[PDB]
Ligand code: HEM
């Protein structure tokens with residue numbers, strides 16, 4: 001009888017609760033372990049679900065292999081399952097869609113279907129501050145992107161180029177890593193030099209002279225603290241009572257506090273011009289519903305834009321130098337282009353002349369092909385999504401993962417994809433280019449289609465707005481490096497593997513190059 005069965009359930013329940021504590025703990029471990037395996041096996045027959053990568057440890061999932069070797073992971077998954085597959089990652093289910101159709105599925109996904117801010121808020125909000133970027137609705141982000149873009153005009157770039165050039169020269173002159181007036185050769189770690197050059201140049205141009213001057217003080221130490229909070233660990237542990245987390249928060253307060261002081265000081269003196277992004281945001285930061293950004297939110301947006309731009313550009317800078325260190329042929333070819341465009345060095349570098357340097361820009365383009373600083377972009381799925389031409393349905397609660405950087409490294413789309421060749425971009429040296437219909441999400445007309453196999457800057461509503469600033473900064477920086485120095489690897493060394501575990505895919509350190517002055521007698525003037 002079924003009556004007597006229900007009795008033995010209750011009996012079994014009471015015997016269960018009365019087990020020796022060791023077997024209880026063991027059952028605490030074995031039961032969800034067994035349940036997990038059984039759940040996957042069952043999930044398999046679901047043909048309205050993409051294949052799920054098998055994993056042994058519950059919650060953890062494929063985190064370790066994804067965390068350490070994401071492209072090798074994607075490649076293995078791809079030839080087993082094809083272009084669409086899911087995997088468990090630290091409690092989340094990630095649905096990957098590789099290739100151009102994946103680019104379309106995720107970057108062009110409707111606003112109602114996916115949320116970037118739900119994916120990233122816990123990473124970024126504690127670092128940047130409240131009320132901006134991912135700590136706000138999408139419509140607010142769109143307009144923040146529009147506000148920042150107002151300091152990213154052609155006219156702005158024309159003024160930034162000599163400021164950036166000045167900083168590069170000052171760095172060559174003053175940094176312990178160079179001191180070109182005293183040394184004709186030396187060794188550097190590019191993961192030391194490039195983050196420093198990147199912060200000095202980006203500060204001077206986007207933040208202005210005051211904020212640049214601050215980096216000549218121990219205030220510079222706060223950026224390091226803030227920098228240390230920008231880490232994937234925030235995806236698991238956003239806030240922990242350690243000193244790492246307190247130094248982060250303290251820095252965000254002191255740094256935004258500093259920006260606010262400058263802001264309120266400019267407003268008090270009515271000293272608001274068109275010098276920098278701070279000026280720009282002081283004059284142009286009213287949303288379409290008439291609500292103004294607070295001084296705090298302005299400062300916080302400044303932090304995030306600068307920090308995001310910081311890591312992508314520094315990493316890219318580092319890779320350019322690293323690839324060129326074993327390619328004296330490319331160094332030579334870039335140098336000839338410098339001599340031609342700048343009339344033997346007699347012409348001062350300008351933003352317009354930068355545009356007349358196709359090989360230089362192709363080098364940047366090719367470096368971003370081989371080293372997309374962001375190997376995975378995420379969205380949280382908010383409504384059930386049907387996968388076109390499939391029976392797959394991606395349920396709300398899932399995350400979608402797109403990886404243009406993976407496609408960058410596929411021979412199908414880039415022959416001999418693991419060879420560095422700037423000439424694969426001959427007569428195709430633009431940072432990117434819309435060549436079909438365009439669309440405006442709030443921050444300017446951008447390409448409607450996002451099916452290009454090359455997407456260093458993403459696409460759709462979350463597309464990068466720093467692409468031309470990045471080319472301007474990298475361009476000026478590399479133009480001066482090329483014209484000033486040659487460099488090569490220490491004996492036996494080559495391009496290092498990427499460190500896929502940090503927030504951007506930095507080179508594994510220490511990554512050293514040996515530089516030498518092209519003109520040992522050349523001196524850099526100024527104080
Ligand atoms: C080589 C350098 C850079 C690369 C490769 C890059 C790449 C990207 C990518 C792939 C995205 C899309 C992220 C997503 O879909 O989730 C993005 C978004 C964005 N980037 Fe960049 N970026 C670079 C430099 C910069 C710079 C210099 C700035 C600021 C001056 C910047 C600011 C932004 C902003 C404001 C967004 C929008 C985020 C959103 O809408 O959710 N980036 N970038």
Ligand SMILES: OC(Cn1cncn1)(Cn1cncn1)c1ccc(F)cc1F
Nearest residue numbers: 133304305307308309312374376464503
């Ligand atoms: O897209 C990022 C955030 N992110 C996503 N994965 C890793 N970091 C990075 N980024 C893109 N360009 C520059 N940085 C971002 C976007 C906007 C922003 F203001 C900061 C920021 F970190």
